[PDB]
Amino acid sequence: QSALTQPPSASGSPGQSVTISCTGTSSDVGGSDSVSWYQQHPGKAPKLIIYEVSQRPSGVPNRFSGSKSGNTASLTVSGLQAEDDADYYCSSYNLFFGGGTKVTVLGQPKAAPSVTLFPPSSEELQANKATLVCLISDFYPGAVTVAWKADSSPVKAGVETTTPSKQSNNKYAASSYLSLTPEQWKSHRSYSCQVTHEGSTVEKTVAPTE
């Protein structure tokens, strides 16, 4: 979990606006005008687009604006263009990072994920494995976050999630798996997979059977 809190994702068609938030404490965001925003194209070096909450370096157009209210800073991108499709990170100066927001300029219609939660198979149990798998298919944009629950409360370790890939129907698919031991699986009431895409969250629950 990132020292600063940014929504995972955001999207618009060309010419639309997107606003993205970055929340900290009075110790960082809420005490000093030292919030920066970075634009990073997958594979490339980051570009500084805002510093000290609101300042644009030279070459950064006025489409990009930065504001701060109490313990939360926002970056607004107006008139979205192709080239604005990237990862956006905030920071606060020691130095604290947000977890990043994937900003998509819609290349096709939005599609909500199909989510299927599989309990452990017979065969893997007899190998002392209780890996759960949350299959997430047929979504756009190709940005998703997965949380896992044990009973009525969050779980931490175990969780792996694949990088979403574009399938034959031109929508994205990914897999989140929780590598449980049979003892962990058999000793809880239920486990749950929570899939967040385009600000809506889907929950699936499974429990052990006989």
Ligand X SMILES: CC1=NC(NN/C=C/Cc2ccccc2[N+](=O)[O-])=NC(=O)C1
Task: Find the shortest distance in angstroms from Cβ 136 to a second copy.
Answer: 9
Q: Helix (H, G, I), strand (E, B), or coil: what is residue 149?
A: strand
Residue 34: contacted member of a second copy, ligand X, none (CB under 5 to 8 Å, by partner type): ligand X
Q: What distance in Å separates the CA atoms of residue 35 and residue 94, rounded to the nearest whole number?
A: 12
Q: Give the one residue of 37, 51, 148, 185 binding a second copy; rule: CB under 8 A.
A: 51
Q: Give the one residue of 93, 167, 199, 207 binding ligand X; rule: CB under 6 A.
A: 93
Tokens 């007899």 correspond to what residue? 126
Task: Find the shortest distance in angstroms from Cβ 16 to a second copy.
Answer: 25
How many separate helices (H) and strands (E) can be counted in the chain?
2, 18
98 versus 120: smaller Cβ distance to ligand X: 98
Closest by Cα among 89, 102, 202, 192 to 150: 192
Is there binding between residue 34 and ligand X (CB under 6 A)? yes
46 versus 158: smaller Cβ distance to ligand X: 46
CA atoms 101, 113, 142, 179: torsion sign: positive
Task: Find the shortest distance in angstroms from Cβ 57 to ligand X.
Answer: 11
The answer to whether 197 and 146 have CB atoms below 8 angstroms apart is no
Tokens standing for residue 209: 């059977």
CA angle centred on 141, ends 194 and 9, rounded to 5°: 60
Is there binding between residue 117 and a second copy (CB under 8 A)? yes
Is there binding between residue 29 and a second copy (CB under 8 A)? no
Tokens standing for residue 197: 């895409």
Residue 204: contacted member of a second copy, ligand X, none (CB under 5 to 8 Å, by partner type): a second copy
Closest by Cα among 120, 126, 109, 123 to 158: 120
DSSP designation for 68 = E
Binding site for a second copy (CB under 8 A): 2-3, 36, 42-48, 51, 55, 57-58, 89, 94-95, 97-100, 116-119, 121, 123-124, 129, 131, 133, 135, 137, 160, 162-165, 167-169, 173-175, 177, 204, 206
Binding site for ligand X (CB under 6 A): 34, 36, 38, 40, 46, 51, 89, 91, 93, 95
